[PDB]
Amino acid sequence: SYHLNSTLESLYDLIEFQPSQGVHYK
Amino acid sequence: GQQYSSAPLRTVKEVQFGLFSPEEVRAISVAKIRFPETMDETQTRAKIGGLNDPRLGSIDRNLKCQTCQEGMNECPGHFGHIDLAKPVFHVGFIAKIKKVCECVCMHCGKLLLDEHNELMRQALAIKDSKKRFAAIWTLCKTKMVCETDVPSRGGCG
Amino acid sequence: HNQFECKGCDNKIDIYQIHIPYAAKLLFQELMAMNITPRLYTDRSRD
Amino acid sequence: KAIPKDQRATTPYMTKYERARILGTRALQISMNAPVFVDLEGETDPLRIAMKELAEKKIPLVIRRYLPDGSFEDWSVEELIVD
Amino acid sequence: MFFIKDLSLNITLHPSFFGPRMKQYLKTKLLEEVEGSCTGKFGYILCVLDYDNIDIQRGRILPTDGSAEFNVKYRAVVFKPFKGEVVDGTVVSCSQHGFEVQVGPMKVFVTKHLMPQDLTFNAGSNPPSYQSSEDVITIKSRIRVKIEGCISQVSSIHAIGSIKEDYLGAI
Amino acid sequence: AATLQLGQEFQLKQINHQGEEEELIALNLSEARLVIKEALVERRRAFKRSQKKTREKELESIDVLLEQTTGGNNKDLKNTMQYLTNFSRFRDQETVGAVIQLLKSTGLHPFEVAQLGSLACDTADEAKTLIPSLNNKISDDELERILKELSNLETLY
């Protein structure tokens, strides 16, 4: 569980929110 | 110019010739044909159950041939039958049947002579059927008595 | 309605179509009227 | 049962019957809008076009010569020596 | 039942389809005729597995017309009904003789005489529904039908079901 | 009927297109959906390859994307997908492998285990009444156990 939490945060640090393009990954 | 059919189209290869069994005749036929009259009593249509009823084929184009429907240019025809109360013989077989009557016993229904006879042993080795029936007929037509005991066998006598 | 039968041998599936002259069909029907069976087979059973 | 290519012992020459049926079937296909493999010199008749394809061996067919024992061979019309 | 069987079909092509890409055309035809249709020998043909490794064998030329004949052997998923087979279905059309259950691509019919006595027909409702002593058989209702007999006509298959026996009726 | 005696093409002995012997393949309404829905995916990849040079909405949408692949002549297969999906409780081929492991452990006929996996029952009498071929070929407690493990394998999707 804890390890999965680590991944779940890391991916959320690379989210680009655009209303016309969606979610991007920088 | 005929109507299309969905059946697979193939050529005609092997053709087998055989006798018509009465059970197969009754299984192929559709009508019994009991009235010797041709057309109906009203001098029109067909007798319905007679010599030429709509249960068989038809001509005149306008008629439809009940059991195929379609038309006369398409109707192959249909077969009736006649169930006799007394068995009759066929002309082209009158001789053959007679030969059979000279090749088998008239009571126990067994072949004359036996496989113990040397001439019968020689005649049975022939591969041709007509020659076998011929020679076996020449042997069995002479002996006019079935037998019960033959030295090295059915009964009767 | 695309329907076929053969009377006396319990078939409603395997039906073959052949093109023969009408005179040959008259010969076969006369043989059937003369107690002779002109059975036609599209396959070679003797091989 | 399909004799192999190294055992084909039939005549390599195309007979008049084979040429006849090849020109007839090929001309029948050409009459039914078949892809022509040779450039036309202005012909309109299908038989002349079929003979034009046979003169250059551009007919895409192969003959199944039946042997009397029930076997057969596959001699393509391109490898068959015409005339 | 949903079975998988290797089927073979003879495909006829017009002489105008003799291009180098003709194989594709074959497969095309092999789909358009086989998928969705029905046969009285193998049942309702559903899908056709293995589209890449389709055997073509050798094409033969029949005499007249010049059309090409092919013998194709493939693997296909078909549906074949059977007599006395418990299946499930949903009603579509309703009749006084019985409601017509829909089992896959087959529209089975259930005779009113093959139903229990408590199940009665009701025409005053819209749509007309069969009301019993506990269950109400409507169009959108799911009913488990036990097929009693099946008919295998060429390119047309109809079956007859029943729900009189136990462990049957509405789902 | 339903007495383990099907037709000629539906006999226990089948022959593939290579000439080898193979047993009859009987499928229940669980993997039968994943096989059609499975092969339609690779069929979509085959249609998009040559082009170069909650549970119901996804079902109907995928059936539309696959309906665009076909020539609009096989919608009964999609309605059959809605039938199976509306009557399916299984998912994922791994669990299906477990189900085959539980069906083949008793040593029954493929059609029988197909009717076992395709029907939702709670007691053994239900399986013995809906399946006339199974009434004494296998124990009732084992069937109830199979229905228990299956009951643990089903999940509302």
Added chain:
Amino acid sequence: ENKDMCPICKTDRYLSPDVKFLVNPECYHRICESCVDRIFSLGPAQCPYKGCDKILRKNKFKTQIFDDVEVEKEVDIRKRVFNVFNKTIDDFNGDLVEYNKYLEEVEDIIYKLDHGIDVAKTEEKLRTYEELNKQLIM
């Protein structure tokens, strides 16, 4: 008996008696094969055995070597109740008095069932069967 085994087929001895004669546990009536097969084949209905009204169900038949309906019912109910009670208060420690008393109670229950009394105690015995089954499930 050789004169009654089916209301329609009561004398099939001179017709080569090759068919069996099944008996339903909810009727205790003899019916020949060709009749009962049509009975449960057309639907679970009652048999016309001398005007019988009890419904004959599908399948669930039995072969009978004939030991009278009384003893057959007493051995069927005897075995069923013996399986419901199982080995409760029997071979748990080795006592002989309480064991024989419990066996006396069971045989008195089977006696009240084969006699019926007034259709009142037998229902309490059925509730006792449901209670014993509930104890066997736990």
Added chain:
Amino acid sequence: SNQALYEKLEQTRTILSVKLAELINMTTIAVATTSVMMVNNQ
């Protein structure tokens, strides 16, 4: 094409609100860690 926005948008609203109430009713009641990640995922 507006009905897809009706059903889709309304579904997102119901999932947002109802899932929010489920969130607050699950924040208030290894079970603890599974509550951590269920709440975080909500």
Added chain:
Amino acid sequence: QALDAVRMRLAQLTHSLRRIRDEMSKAELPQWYTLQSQLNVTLSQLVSVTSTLQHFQETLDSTVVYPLPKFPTTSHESLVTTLLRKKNIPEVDEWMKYVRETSGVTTALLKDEEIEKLLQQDREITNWARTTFRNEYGKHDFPFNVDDVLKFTFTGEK
């Protein structure tokens, strides 16, 4: 019986986490729908295992498991100790004790004897909150014929 499903759900857990490993092993991250889907599968497996685990917590604590003489222990010994190690990883126990230190109630309040009242206040606020959600969810709701004309233009009939 339950572990027969625990091994399958943990198998799907290993397969899902391996698929996420393959998706994250690329240079550029692919689509997010597959990532979030695999994450939802992982969470579904974890919750599915913890549910059955918490359902059978009294049965597993009523038995002991240790290998039989039929075991190659004369060659490998530390492995057998790893297969039956109740001791948690030092990270889960370490951060577990740290969280226990950063929970707002320590052992000093155990000496004061005072926890059930705070729990009662908590449950009461659960009731109040659920009532407020009841109210706040109760506040809102959720010409002619072409063939005839042309027939006139060609024939003139009305």
